[PDB]
């Protein structure tokens, strides 16, 4: 008998930025697992019975609330839209390039709950 | 940051063929994961708080829409029942006969093919 | 195609024993997988969008209905509280020490369903 994992989750409503004047709604689930303490797992509901799963560095999403960050597949930066603070998530794959807007307040509140489970700087205690 | 997986799923109502006289309803989930691109995962809801999980070759379900196929644990073949096309799924472990509605099965496989065309699985 | 797994599950209501006179409700999901025939997986719903996952030896929970058992992370023993038979579950991790009360009848009824799927003594047939 042993403690395998603690999970912190939330549901966010993201916007897929199609154009300057057009966006599509993308419900997303975020999960944090204390057994994988550097990571955040994201499920993007891109269709009724379709999902796309991405893994992010928790520290990249945390930094993305305050300043532009990331190289390679993922670029993150803060901004505002429709009178809300947002985190912009630019994703590159073999398939192509997508731009998503996450509500900053909801993202930050989820990261604060992950910090209560595993304070940043203590991830190594779990490995 | 990295793309771990794309999932395509559907919910089917299958018929457990108990006998010629009587059959039972089995709600099932099918899921295709591009991280496991040769496979289809099936969850058979056999009881209120009970499931049976099977893994199939995608290509076996795809072939089963058109002709009889499989040896060992799984045999699949097309047929008709109550005026609908069905795929018959015979499963052996240490035996169950299931009927899947062909249209719904085929439309799920076509969505998996749009994500990963058969023949390209190895690119993933 | 291969028959990966058969799952037997139940939802129980456990009491987290905070104090002599104070307890908190912990909804818990128990899952038995015939592909992992020695184990019971427990999900403790400790808040709206947080869970704590534990693995137990099925045989430890089974023994815990009848007598005190376990060394290390998990200690289990039968008892009574508010006139109902309970199994006491004491859990230790680097993170936490917890005392939980499970209703004995409901726990036993779940284990009997796992025994109908994989009778104790036959776990090895699955490997």
Numbering used by the authors:
A (entry chain BBB), C (entry chain AAA): -2 to 124
B (entry chain CCC): -2 to 91, 94 to 123
Question: Can you provide the manuscript's text about this entry?
Answer:
In the filamentous bacterium Streptomyces, cell division is positively controlled by SsgB, which recruits FtsZ to the future septum sites and promotes Z-ring formation. Instead, a positive control system has evolved, whereby FtsZ is actively recruited to the septum sites by SsgB, in concert with its paralogue SsgA. SsgB is the archetypical SALP, with a conserved function in the development of actinomycetes. The SsgA-like proteins (SALPs) are a family of regulatory proteins that is unique in sporulating actinobacteria.
In order to gain more insights into the structure–function relationship for key SsgB residues, the structure of S. coelicolor SsgB (ScSsgB) was resolved via X-ray crystallography. The 13 aa residues at the C-terminus were highly mobile and could therefore not be modelled, owing to lack of electron density. ScSsgB trimer adopts a ‘whirly’ shape and is assembled through an antiparallel β-sheet interaction between β1 from one subunit and β4 from the neighbouring subunit. The ScSsgB trimer forms a 12-stranded beta-barrel with an inner diameter of about 20–25 Å. By contrast, the Tf SsgB trimer is assembled mainly through α-helices. The root-mean-square deviation (r.m.s.d.) is 1.9 Å with 92% of all residues aligned in ScSsgB and 87% in Tf SsgB (aa sequence identity between these two proteins is 46%). Residues V115, G118 and E120 cluster together, and are centered on the lid of the beta-barrel consisting of α1, α2–α3 and β1–β2 loop, which is close to the interface between α3 and the rest of the subunit. Residue E120 plays a key role in maintaining the proper angle between α3 and the rest of the protein. Three hydrogen bonds are formed between the E120 side chain and the main chains of E120, T119 and G118 in the α2–α3 loop region. Besides, E120 and V115 provide two additional salt bridges to R55.
